[PDB]
């Protein structure tokens, strides 16, 4: 029963092993969980719309809230979870969602009311609402407007612009903030201590620095570093270099070579060095980000050069965000910034 769950969690990757089960495990998204804890004692949970960067804990927060609300018994009877792996057209929204909303709430047991608040409403959550078409979204308007007495709607998305304006107005907007080093160092250190991850001083803070506001990727990188340090068995501590090696970060010397080729060099030398660099597998997004950090941070370039480098890096990132060829985009970016 519970022991099987404990063992399955212990044999699970750290992303799912340390998933927040209660509203207190949320480390940084405090403004939302404060309201969620206050409404736990009341019974006026409004329709909610979670939006923010990926890996901020929206799904974990709503799961912990539904748990703390309904208990592990009513967790499976008063919840309608619809993900992006299911059909969510107009037909589905009109039939299934509306039939579940029109239905009455299931009767709680005697053990439920003694430990959990058991609100008189159920919860219908729609994860990854970006893939929902606007007509199927507008179909949900009156469905969530008239049956609010018996069901509550929780939308979850990454881009709040993909959801129509009426739905965004009907739901309370909860913006999840990026999890940088400051507001996630406590959670990362807790995960490291619970797994006996022996690292150096500036490793964890560096990991989140590579994560760029993503605790899931940071936990995955920490698990990979711990596995790589346990395989060696040397008993030493994990270093920031070993972490940034497996995180896809280009070494500093290879980036300085690119800066030298951009500063001094013609089209042919730059093209040859780019062709050689693309042989070693590096993500073009990470290279663009590192070049942006170096160029904007270095206090040795003119402001007129800085405006142009910022606009060129922005254009290159916007083009790379569409599935383009990394080699062509990187070469074009380096050539354009070399003419400056």
């Amino acid at each position: 029963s519970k022991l099987a769950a404990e063992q399955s969690l212990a044999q699970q990757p750290w992303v799912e092993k340390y998933r927040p089960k209660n509203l207190d495990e949320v480390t940084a998204q405090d403004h939302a969980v404060t309201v969620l804890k206050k409404t736990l004692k009341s019974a006026n949970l409004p329709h909610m719309l979670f939006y923010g960067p990926p890996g901020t804990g929206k799904t974990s927060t709503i799961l912990a809230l539904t748990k703390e609300l309904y208990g592990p018994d009513l967790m499976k009877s008063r919840i309608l979870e619809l993900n992006a792996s299911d059909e969510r057209g107009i037909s589905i929204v009109r039939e299934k969602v509306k039939n579940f909303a029109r239905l009455t709430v299931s009767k709680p047991s005697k053990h439920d009311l003694e430990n959990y608040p058991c609100p008189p409403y159920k919860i219908i959550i729609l994860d990854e609402a970006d893939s929902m078409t606007a007509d199927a979204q507008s179909a949900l308007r009156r469905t969530m407007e008239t049956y609010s007495g018996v069901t509550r709607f929780c939308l979850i998305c990454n881009y709040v612009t993909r959801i129509i304006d009426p739905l965004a107005s009907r739901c309370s907007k909860f913006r999840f903030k990026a999890l940088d080093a400051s507001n996630a160092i406590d959670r990362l250190r807790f995960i490291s201590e619970q797994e006996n991850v022996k690292c150096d001083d500036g490793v964890l803070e560096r990991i989140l620095d590579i994560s760029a506001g993503d605790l899931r990727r940071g936990i995955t990188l920490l698990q990979s570093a711990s596995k790589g340090a346990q395989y060696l068995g040397d008993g030493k501590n994990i270093t920031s270099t070993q972490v940034e090696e497996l995180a896809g970060v280009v070494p500093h010397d290879i980036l300085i070579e690119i800066v030298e080729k951009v500063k001094s060099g013609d089209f042919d030398e730059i093209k040859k060095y780019v062709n050689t660099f693309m042989k070693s597998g590096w993500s073009a997004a990470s290279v663009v980000n590192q070049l942006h950090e170096y160029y904007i941070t270095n206090d040795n370039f003119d402001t007129n050069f800085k405006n142009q480098i910022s606009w060129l890096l922005f254009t290159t990132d916007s083009r790379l965000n569409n599935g383009t060829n990394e080699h062509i985009q990187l070469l074009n970016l380096l050539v354009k910034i070399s003419q400056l």
């Binding site: 239905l103 009455t104 709430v105 009767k107 018996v150």
Partner: protein
């Protein structure tokens, strides 16, 4: 709580057959003097109203009224397990999320039990029945069904006209026109075939054939049908049960 046992599951199945198709949601309410149920179609031209007194049941217990709404389609889907001769017991607590239908054969043998999910419907029972109607008539329901089935083919509207000692059903459409004229008469050879008519005022109303077709289903519950018409309100077609009745109120076409 709800605790109503029908001697034969068949009675309940025929009653629900009456709500079937023409309405989607039904609101039931059990109480000390029996069970009532109301359902209104989407266009709001038809109201189906049921009343089953305590005596229609083999066992009925109610110390606390319960109101429950449900999807009829879901109900009928489940309403073909009665074997007709099976015993049927409707069961529900005072604050139900479901309605339990329990079919059992005489012997302990086979027990089919269902737990139907309920819908929340704002309780708002209508009381549109009139004290007096312009005209009142009853006739065999199979005869009424034939009359409706005849005329239906000709038009989407069937007119009912009443004058002293004369009842006339008329349809007129594309292929032509038709009419069925019946006269009041007492048959002593068996009065269940008689045709009674009490007219206080001549009436002439038109109804949508699609609705009259839904209404004729009540023939399966009673030998006779009562029709009450008025120029001031929806018409009433009524099918009596032993301790109870199934009523259809239909708004005339403007």
């Amino acid at each position: 709580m709800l605790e109503a046992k029908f001697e034969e599951a068949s009675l309940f199945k025929r009653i629900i057959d009456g709500f079937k198709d023409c309405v989607q949601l039904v609101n039931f309410q059990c109480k000390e003097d029996g069970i009532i149920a109301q359902a209104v179609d989407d266009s709001r031209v038809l109201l189906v109203s049921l009343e089953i007194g305590v005596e229609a049941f083999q066992e009925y217990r109610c110390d606390h009224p319960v109101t429950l709404g449900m999807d009829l389609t879901s109900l009928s889907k489940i309403l073909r397990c009665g074997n007709n001769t099976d015993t049927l017991t409707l069961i529900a607590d005072n604050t139900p999320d479901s309605i339990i239908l329990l079919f059992e054969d005489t012997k302990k043998d086979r027990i089919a039990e269902y737990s139907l999910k309920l819908m929340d419907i704002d309780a708002d029972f209508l009381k549109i029945e009139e004290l007096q109607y312009d005209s009142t008539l009853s006739l065999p329901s199979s005869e009424f069904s034939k009359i409706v089935r005849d005329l239906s083919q000709l038009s989407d509207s069937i007119n009912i006209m009443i004058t002293k000692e004369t009842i006339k059903f008329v349809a007129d459409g594309d292929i032509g026109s038709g009419s069925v004229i019946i006269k009041p008469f007492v048959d002593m050879e068996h009065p269940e075939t008689s045709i009674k008519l009490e007219m206080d005022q001549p009436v002439d109303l038109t109804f949508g054939a699609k609705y009259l077709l839904d209404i004729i289903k009540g023939s399966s519950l009673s030998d006779r049908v009562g029709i009450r018409l008025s120029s001031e309100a929806p018409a009433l077609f009524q099918f009596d049960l032993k301790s109870g009745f199934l009523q259809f109120f239909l708004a005339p076409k403007f």
